Amino acid sequence: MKLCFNEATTLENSNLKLDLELCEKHGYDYIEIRTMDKLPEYLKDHSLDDLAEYFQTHHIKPLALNALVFFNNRDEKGHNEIITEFKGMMETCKTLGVKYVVAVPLVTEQKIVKEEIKKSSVDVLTELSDIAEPYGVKIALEFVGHPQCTVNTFEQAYEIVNTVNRDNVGLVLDSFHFHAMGSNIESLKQADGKKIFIYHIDDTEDFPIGFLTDEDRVWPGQGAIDLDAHLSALKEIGFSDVVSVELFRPEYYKLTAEEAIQTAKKTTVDVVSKYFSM
Numbered sequence: 310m311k312l313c314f315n316e317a318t319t320l321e322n323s324n325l326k327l328d329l330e331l332c333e334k335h336g337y338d339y340i341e342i343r344t345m346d347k348l349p350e351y352l353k354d355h356s357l358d359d360l361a362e363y364f365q366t367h368h369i370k371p372l373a374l375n376a377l378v379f380f381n382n383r384d385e386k387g388h389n390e391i392i393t394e395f396k397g398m399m400e401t402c403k404t405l406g407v408k409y410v411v412a413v414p415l416v417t418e419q420k421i422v423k424e425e426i427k428k429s430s431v432d433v434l435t436e437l438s439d440i441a442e443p444y445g446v447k448i449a450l451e452f453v454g455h456p457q458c459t460v461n462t463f464e465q466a467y468e469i470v471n472t473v474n475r476d477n478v479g480l481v482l483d484s485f486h487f488h489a490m491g492s493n494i495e496s497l498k499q500a501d502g503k504k505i506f507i508y509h510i511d512d513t514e515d516f517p518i519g520f521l522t523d524e525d526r527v528w529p530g531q532g533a534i535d536l537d538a539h540l541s542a543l544k545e546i547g548f549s550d551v552v553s554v555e556l557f558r559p560e561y562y563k564l565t566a567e568e569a570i571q572t573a574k575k576t577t578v579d580v581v582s583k584y585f586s587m
Contacts (some may be wrong), residue, residue, distance in 0.1 A: 454489025
């Protein structure tokens, strides 16, 4: 199983250029590039071609572009924003050799029935799938374990992915998100491992579901998530490609970029290697 670094981990104490240098130095196989801040920042004094050249001449590679944000249940205008950004991301993926694009569900205060959320999500993901085919890029739907996210549990997200029924549409299983709204481990054990595109590892302070937010995450193994169960389930259903470490804790931004990157690697490897050869 390969090791990936998610830039949220060093959101406030690093940049893409430095993340690349340090992740490469510390043996990471992949990096998830953030499109809302890190990439634009990098492009202020660098070209996409420069970045493509970096990946061509180093071991590390870009696993995914992080988050096409709030893709479902949008009005005509919002849908246009979503499709326009996705099309732009396809060109970025092509230039950099990016394998996946992470899709994040709409976060809203509005109550929408689950079948309306499912129909919209399925329709949009199918449209995104159609667009992605000529690029060979795959979409990974990341359900978010937040009480205001329209798709906040594993089974709800899995139902959507299965209904879309496309080889280029799968899931991002994030341990924190799975734990944060109480997803059922039995549902994961009954899932098709091939539909799990990316696995995000992290842990959390033990607050009740509903109260948990991303700032509550802690290093893998230092929290209350039943990571033993998550890892055991992933192994049982055949998933084993890659694990990416993603943190949003203010405390860790106090560390240097390298300390954070090295700690993210040690905690992750020490936990994951107990189930998977790395």
